[PDB]
Scaffold this active site. Structure first.
Site, PDB file in Angstrom:
ATOM      1  N   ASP A   1      70.821  44.070  80.090  1.00  0.00           N
ATOM      2  CA  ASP A   1      70.553  44.209  78.936  1.00  0.00           C
ATOM      3  C   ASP A   1      71.181  43.507  77.720  1.00  0.00           C
ATOM      4  O   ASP A   1      72.347  43.424  77.623  1.00  0.00           O
ATOM      5  CB  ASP A   1      70.500  45.830  78.434  1.00  0.00           C
ATOM      6  CG  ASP A   1      69.601  46.718  79.451  1.00  0.00           C
ATOM      7  OD1 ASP A   1      70.179  47.978  79.577  1.00  0.00           O
ATOM      8  OD2 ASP A   1      68.750  46.322  80.000  1.00  0.00           O
TER       9      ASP A   1
ATOM     10  N   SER B   1      72.503  45.736  62.595  1.00  0.00           N
ATOM     11  CA  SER B   1      71.424  46.054  62.314  1.00  0.00           C
ATOM     12  C   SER B   1      70.602  45.061  61.316  1.00  0.00           C
ATOM     13  O   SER B   1      71.350  44.588  60.348  1.00  0.00           O
ATOM     14  CB  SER B   1      71.797  47.269  61.469  1.00  0.00           C
ATOM     15  OG  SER B   1      70.428  47.986  61.133  1.00  0.00           O
TER      16      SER B   1
ATOM     17  N   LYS C   1      82.924  50.228  80.257  1.00  0.00           N
ATOM     18  CA  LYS C   1      82.455  49.440  79.096  1.00  0.00           C
ATOM     19  C   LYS C   1      83.541  48.407  78.650  1.00  0.00           C
ATOM     20  O   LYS C   1      83.220  47.509  77.902  1.00  0.00           O
ATOM     21  CB  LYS C   1      81.965  50.374  78.038  1.00  0.00           C
ATOM     22  CG  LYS C   1      80.738  51.119  78.146  1.00  0.00           C
ATOM     23  CD  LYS C   1      80.024  51.955  77.229  1.00  0.00           C
ATOM     24  CE  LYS C   1      78.947  52.849  77.296  1.00  0.00           C
ATOM     25  NZ  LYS C   1      79.108  53.918  78.213  1.00  0.00           N
TER      26      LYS C   1
ATOM     27  N   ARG D   1      69.792  44.893  86.051  1.00  0.00           N
ATOM     28  CA  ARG D   1      68.979  44.817  85.007  1.00  0.00           C
ATOM     29  C   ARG D   1      70.249  44.453  83.803  1.00  0.00           C
ATOM     30  O   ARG D   1      71.072  45.266  83.673  1.00  0.00           O
ATOM     31  CB  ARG D   1      68.129  46.224  84.563  1.00  0.00           C
ATOM     32  CG  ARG D   1      67.072  45.971  83.552  1.00  0.00           C
ATOM     33  CD  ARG D   1      66.568  47.202  82.767  1.00  0.00           C
ATOM     34  NE  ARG D   1      67.653  47.905  82.140  1.00  0.00           N
ATOM     35  CZ  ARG D   1      67.548  49.090  81.793  1.00  0.00           C
ATOM     36  NH1 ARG D   1      66.486  49.951  82.113  1.00  0.00           N
ATOM     37  NH2 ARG D   1      68.844  49.759  81.463  1.00  0.00           N
TER      38      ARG D   1
ATOM     39  N   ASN E   1      73.086  46.750  84.607  1.00  0.00           N
ATOM     40  CA  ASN E   1      72.884  47.960  85.506  1.00  0.00           C
ATOM     41  C   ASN E   1      72.740  47.542  86.718  1.00  0.00           C
ATOM     42  O   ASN E   1      71.744  46.963  87.417  1.00  0.00           O
ATOM     43  CB  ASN E   1      71.543  48.753  85.129  1.00  0.00           C
ATOM     44  CG  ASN E   1      71.596  48.962  83.614  1.00  0.00           C
ATOM     45  OD1 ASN E   1      71.722  48.400  82.560  1.00  0.00           O
ATOM     46  ND2 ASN E   1      72.024  50.407  83.217  1.00  0.00           N
TER      47      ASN E   1
ATOM     48  N   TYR F   1      49.111  65.639  67.121  1.00  0.00           N
ATOM     49  CA  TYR F   1      50.623  65.073  67.724  1.00  0.00           C
ATOM     50  C   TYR F   1      50.743  63.914  68.614  1.00  0.00           C
ATOM     51  O   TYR F   1      49.823  64.186  69.639  1.00  0.00           O
ATOM     52  CB  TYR F   1      51.408  66.565  68.145  1.00  0.00           C
ATOM     53  CG  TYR F   1      52.908  66.102  68.483  1.00  0.00           C
ATOM     54  CD1 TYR F   1      53.216  65.998  69.904  1.00  0.00           C
ATOM     55  CD2 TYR F   1      53.763  65.783  67.570  1.00  0.00           C
ATOM     56  CE1 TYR F   1      54.726  65.567  70.309  1.00  0.00           C
ATOM     57  CE2 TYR F   1      55.126  65.497  67.925  1.00  0.00           C
ATOM     58  CZ  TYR F   1      55.300  65.309  69.442  1.00  0.00           C
ATOM     59  OH  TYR F   1      56.861  65.093  69.858  1.00  0.00           O
TER      60      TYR F   1
ATOM     61  N   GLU G   1      74.549  45.684  78.251  1.00  0.00           N
ATOM     62  CA  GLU G   1      74.908  46.300  79.544  1.00  0.00           C
ATOM     63  C   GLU G   1      74.460  45.599  80.748  1.00  0.00           C
ATOM     64  O   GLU G   1      73.482  44.784  80.816  1.00  0.00           O
ATOM     65  CB  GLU G   1      74.625  47.762  79.574  1.00  0.00           C
ATOM     66  CG  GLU G   1      75.483  48.524  78.530  1.00  0.00           C
ATOM     67  CD  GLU G   1      74.886  50.007  78.434  1.00  0.00           C
ATOM     68  OE1 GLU G   1      75.509  50.760  77.536  1.00  0.00           O
ATOM     69  OE2 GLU G   1      74.032  50.410  79.316  1.00  0.00           O
TER      70      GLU G   1
ATOM     71  N   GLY H   1      65.870  51.433  87.538  1.00  0.00           N
ATOM     72  CA  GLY H   1      64.942  52.387  87.915  1.00  0.00           C
ATOM     73  C   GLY H   1      63.850  51.770  89.000  1.00  0.00           C
ATOM     74  O   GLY H   1      63.617  50.422  88.829  1.00  0.00           O
TER      75      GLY H   1
ATOM     76  N   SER I   1      75.244  58.645  78.066  1.00  0.00           N
ATOM     77  CA  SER I   1      74.418  58.851  77.005  1.00  0.00           C
ATOM     78  C   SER I   1      75.139  59.883  76.105  1.00  0.00           C
ATOM     79  O   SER I   1      74.818  59.996  74.701  1.00  0.00           O
ATOM     80  CB  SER I   1      73.117  59.286  77.313  1.00  0.00           C
ATOM     81  OG  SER I   1      72.939  60.813  78.091  1.00  0.00           O
TER      82      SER I   1
ATOM     83  N   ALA J   1      78.402  47.804  65.245  1.00  0.00           N
ATOM     84  CA  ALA J   1      77.141  47.877  65.171  1.00  0.00           C
ATOM     85  C   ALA J   1      76.402  46.688  64.534  1.00  0.00           C
ATOM     86  O   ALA J   1      76.847  46.223  63.729  1.00  0.00           O
ATOM     87  CB  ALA J   1      76.427  49.191  64.346  1.00  0.00           C
TER      88      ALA J   1
ATOM     89  N   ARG K   1      67.104  43.825  68.050  1.00  0.00           N
ATOM     90  CA  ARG K   1      65.855  43.953  69.155  1.00  0.00           C
ATOM     91  C   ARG K   1      66.527  44.001  70.497  1.00  0.00           C
ATOM     92  O   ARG K   1      67.438  43.190  70.823  1.00  0.00           O
ATOM     93  CB  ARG K   1      65.144  42.738  69.042  1.00  0.00           C
ATOM     94  CG  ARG K   1      64.296  42.654  67.927  1.00  0.00           C
ATOM     95  CD  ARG K   1      63.582  41.088  67.769  1.00  0.00           C
ATOM     96  NE  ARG K   1      62.698  40.990  68.672  1.00  0.00           N
ATOM     97  CZ  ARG K   1      62.087  39.707  69.212  1.00  0.00           C
ATOM     98  NH1 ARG K   1      62.347  38.583  68.102  1.00  0.00           N
ATOM     99  NH2 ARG K   1      61.132  39.742  70.009  1.00  0.00           N
TER     100      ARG K   1
ATOM    101  N   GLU L   1      70.822  62.044  85.715  1.00  0.00           N
ATOM    102  CA  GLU L   1      69.768  61.015  86.055  1.00  0.00           C
ATOM    103  C   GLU L   1      69.330  61.432  87.532  1.00  0.00           C
ATOM    104  O   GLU L   1      68.702  60.681  88.014  1.00  0.00           O
ATOM    105  CB  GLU L   1      70.274  59.586  86.042  1.00  0.00           C
ATOM    106  CG  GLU L   1      70.891  59.150  84.647  1.00  0.00           C
ATOM    107  CD  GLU L   1      72.174  58.433  84.790  1.00  0.00           C
ATOM    108  OE1 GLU L   1      71.903  56.843  85.106  1.00  0.00           O
ATOM    109  OE2 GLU L   1      73.370  58.911  84.702  1.00  0.00           O
TER     110      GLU L   1
END
Lengths: 311, 319
Positions: free
Chosen positions: B270, B193, B116, B268, B284, B229, B282, B288, B160, B191, B196, B13
Site C-alpha cells: 500500500d 493531506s 511499523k 499487497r 501486507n 439510506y 504498508e 485477503g 486498527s 499526516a 490518494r 480479522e
C-alpha cells in the site's frame, strides 16, 4: 515459581549449550526441570534429559517435535538453544503460540539479530556504526563497493560455516557459491585488521543496563585458547561509548532478556559486530563473568532473567 | 499435492480470515484440507472446521495448541491468519520447526513487516520513500522533528485500534497513553493531506512480478431522495487512474521493497500519493482472498486468473 530449561538443539553449539544448561541448573534460585533437544531434532524429557546433560551430548532423542510436554507446569521457559531453531525466533514463536512466558528476545528481535543483513540495515539507519557491507543473493551480479580483503558468509546462518576470507575479486564468485549453499542470501563485509574484539553484556527489557566492557584476546596455536580480559584495557571514554552503543542497539531492536553485544575496535573506530540474544552460561562464559564484575552475582543474574520474563 | 489451509485466528480479522479460506477452497486447483483456529485459541479439524466455515465464526475450538494434525499428509501449508499469531512470524516459526513448506513470508520478513518502526527503518535505509516518522516507547519523552498534524499508533502493523490523529502537541501525551494501551511501542507518522491510497500486488519469491496498480476511494454513507439510506462504500479502481510514470514508479517501488525485505510468495503493498510524491505506507504479507479483496482482483486484471494465482503461490512455497 517453576522454570523449564530447554537445551541442546540441532546446531553445532549443541554441547556448549548443555554446558551452560548445567551452569544454570547448578545455580538457578528456582525449582527447574530440564528438557533436551537432540541432534536429530527429537526431544528428551525427564530423567532421560538429565542423562544427556551428564554425557554432554544427545545424538538422538525420543520425542518428535512438538514433544508431549506439560507446559502448564511451568511459569517461565528458559530457551538455551543456539543458531537455527534456537536464537532465530522459531522456538520463540512456538512458545508464543503455547502462551508461555520465556526468557530472552522475542520472535522479531531474535530473527533480526540472526540476519547479518537486515540487522545491519536497521542499526546503520539508527546511527550505530557497523562494518561496511553488502548483501548478495543467489543469481544476482555482485556489487562490492570496497576492495578486498573482506568476508563472505551466508546471511542468517549465524555460525562460522560457509564463511570465507576473499583476498582477490577473482575468488568472490567461488566464495558466494559456498555461502549460497547455506542461505539464498549472503553478506560481504570489509575485513578489518588490526582489530580488537570487545564484548559487553546487557540485561533488562528494551531499556537495559550494561555490564562492564570486556575484551577477547586469542593466544597462539598449539586452536589458541581465548583469553577474556575483564575489564578490558580501554580509555575511560571509549568504554562508555561501547556501553552506550550496546544499549542503543538493544533498544532499537527491542531485545528483552539479555544479550551479549560484540564490537570491533579498529584504529580508534568502533563497529557493532554482533548482538547475541542467547549467550553462554557456563560460569566460565564471558557473559555471566562480565556481570559478576558488575556486582551481579550469578544466581542473582538468573533470578532477574526469569523475573524479566514475566514483565 | 495436498494442501493444508489454516484460517480463523484470535485476531479481530478472524471472520475475514474465514471468508478468505472460503475463497481459496472454492478455486484452489489442488486437494485441500482446512484447519481453523477458533477465537478462544483452540483448533477445529476435519468436518468441524468445515462446519465453522459455514457459520462465518468459530468462537470455540476443541484442541489446545499444538493441534493433533497429521502434518505428514501435507505438501505445503497455506496460512491465512491476519495479525497477531498470523503474519507476525509465530505460525511461520512453528511451521519451520515442523519442517513444513508454507505459503508467504518467512519469520524475519513477517515479523519485520508487522512492525511499523523497524520496517520503515529498513526501507528508509534502502532508499525507499516512507512517511516521515519517529518511534516512542512508554517512559521515553516524545521527541518529534515534525509539526502536527500526525498519527500516533501502536507499533504493530495492521492494528486498527489505538490510532489517533493529534492536532496539537499538547494532545500528544494523550494519544500516546492511548497507543501504549495496546503496544509498548508507538510511532508518530506525519499526516499528508489530501492523499490518494494506491495498492499493488506482488507475486513470487524475493524477485517478484507486480500486478496492475489499484486505487481505493471512500464513499460516505448518505440519505437519498428516492432510495433512502445508502451505506458508505470502499471503491476499488482497477487499474487506478494514474499517468504511466507514476504507475511504474509505485510498481517498481513495490518490487524493490519486496526484494529488500526478502518477502516470499505474495504481498499487497500500500502506498500514499500526495502532491506528486509516493510514500510506501504498508506491506501486507497475508492479503485477503475474498472474491472482493483487492489482492486477487488486481492479479485478475493482470491476466492471472484466481485458480492460477493459488497454484503459483503453492508451487512457490516449494520454491
Amino acid at each position: 515459581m517453576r522454570v523449564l530449561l530447554i537445551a541442546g538443539g540441532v546446531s553445532p553449539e549443541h554441547e556448549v549449550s548443555l554446558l551452560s544448561a548445567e551452569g544454570v541448573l547448578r545455580h538457578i534460585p528456582f525449582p527447574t526441570d530440564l528438557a533436551v533437544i537432540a541432534q536429530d531434532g527429537r526431544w528428551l524429557l525427564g530423567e532421560k534429559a538429565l542423562t544427556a546433560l551428564e554425557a554432554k551430548a544427545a545424538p538422538e532423542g525420543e520425542h518428535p517435535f512438538p514433544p508431549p510436554l506439560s507446559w502448564e507446569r511451568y511459569d517461565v521457559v528458559f530457551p538455551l538453544l543456539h543458531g537455527r531453531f534456537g536464537e532465530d525466533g522459531t522456538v520463540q514463536g512456538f512458545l508464543e503460540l503455547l502462551g508461555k512466558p520465556y526468557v530472552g528476545a522475542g520472535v522479531a528481535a531474535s530473527a533480526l539479530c540472526m540476519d547479518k543483513d537486515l540487522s545491519k540495515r536497521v542499526l546503520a539507519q539508527a546511527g550505530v556504526p557497523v562494518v561496511p557491507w553488502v548483501a548478495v543473493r543467489k543469481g544476482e551480479p555482485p556489487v562490492v563497493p570496497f576492495d578486498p580483503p573482506f568476508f563472505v558468509k551466508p546471511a542468517n546462518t549465524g555460525s562460522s560455516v560457509g564463511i570465507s576470507r576473499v583476498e582477490r575479486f577473482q575468488d568472490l564468485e567461488a566464495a558466494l557459491a559456498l555461502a549460497f549453499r547455506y542461505d539464498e542470501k549472503a553478506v560481504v563485509e570489509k575485513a578489518l585488521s588490526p582489530v580488537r574484539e570487545l564484548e559487553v553484556g546487557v540485561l533488562g527489557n528494551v531499556f537495559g543496563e550494561a555490564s562492564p566492557v570486556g575484551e577477547v584476546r586469542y593466544e597462539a596455536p598449539f586452536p589458541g585458547r581465548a583469553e577474556l580480559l575483564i575489564p578490558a584495557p580501554l580509555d575511560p571514554g571509549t568504554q562508555e561509548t561501547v556501553q552506550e552503543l550496546a544499549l542503543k542497539a538493544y533498544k532499537v531492536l527491542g531485545v528483552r532478556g539479555m544479550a551479549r553485544v560484540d564490537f570491533f575496535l579498529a584504529e580508534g573506530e568502533l563497529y557493532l559486530n554482533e548482538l547475541n540474544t542467547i549467550p553462554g552460561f557456563t560460569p566460565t562464559s564471558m557473559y555471566p563473568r562480565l556481570f559478576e564484575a558488575g556486582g551481579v552475582a550469578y544466581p542473582e543474574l538468573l533470578r532477574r532473567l526469569v523475573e524479566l520474563a514475566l514483565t
